[PDB]
Write a protein that binds this ligand. Structure first.
Ligand code: HEM
Ligand SMILES: Oc1ccc(Cl)cc1Cl
Length: 137
C-alpha cells in the first residue's frame, strides 16, 4: 500500500527520484521553463550533473516526508503551506504539481514493481487541493 511504497521508494531514493523526474521532464517538455539548466541534455547527461542528482534527491527526500506525515493520502496543512511559501517555488502553479504526479503514477504503473498506484494518484490530487487552499494559484 501507500505506506509501503514510501519505504520502497526510500530504499532506492536517488535512482527513483531521478527516473521519476526524468519521466516528468520528458512527458512535459515545456516544464523545463522552470529548469533552464536541463535543456539540451539527454537523460544520461542530466544524471552526470551534480545539481541534477543532489536537488532531485532533496526534492524526493521531502516528498517522502510529506507522504509519511499524511493521513489517508491527505498531507498536513503545515506541509502544504511550506511548499507554497518556499522561495524556490515562487513562480509555481498547481498545474506544475498535478503534472508531476501524473508522471509519477504513470511511472509506477509501467514499473512492474507492485506500487499502490491509485493511492499516489489520490495523494497528488490531495496535495493539489491543499496547495490551493494554502494559496498557490
Ligand atoms: C511534492 C512535490 C515537491 C517537493 C517535496 C519539492 C521540494 C523541493 C525542494 C526540497 C527543493 C530544494 C532542492 C535543493 O535546493 O536542493 C525544491 C526546489 C525547487 N523546486 Fe520543488 N518540490 C516539489 C514540487 C515541485 C514542482 C512540481 C516544481 C515545478 C514543476 C518544482 C520546482 C522547483 C524549483 C524550480 C526549485 C529550485 C531550482 C532547483 O532546485 O533546481 N518543485 N523543491
Ligand atoms: O531537482 C528537481 C527534481 C524534481 C523537481 Cl519537481 C524539482 C527539482 Cl529542483
Amino acid at each position: 500500500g501507500f505506506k509501503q511504497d514510501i519505504a520502497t521508494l526510500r530504499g532506492d531514493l536517488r535512482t527513483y527520484a531521478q527516473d521519476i523526474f526524468l519521466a516528468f521532464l520528458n512527458k512535459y517538455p515545456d516544464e523545463k521553463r522552470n529548469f533552464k539548466n536541463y535543456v539540451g541534455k539527454s537523460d544520461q547527461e542530466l544524471k552526470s550533473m551534480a545539481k541534477f542528482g543532489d536537488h532531485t534527491e532533496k526534492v524526493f527526500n521531502l516528498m517522502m516526508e510529506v507522504a509519511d506525515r499524511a493521513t489517508d493520502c491527505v498531507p498536513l496543512a503545515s506541509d502544504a503551506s511550506t511548499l507554497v511559501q518556499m522561495k524556490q517555488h515562487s513562480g509555481l502553479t498547481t498545474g506544475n504539481f498535478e503534472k508531476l504526479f501524473v508522471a509519477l503514477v504513470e511511472y509506477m504503473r509501467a514499473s512492474g514493481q507492485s506500487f499502490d498506484s491509485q493511492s499516489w494518484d489520490r495523494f497528488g490530487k490531495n496535495l493539489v487541493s491543499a496547495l490551493s487552499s494554502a494559496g498557490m494559484k
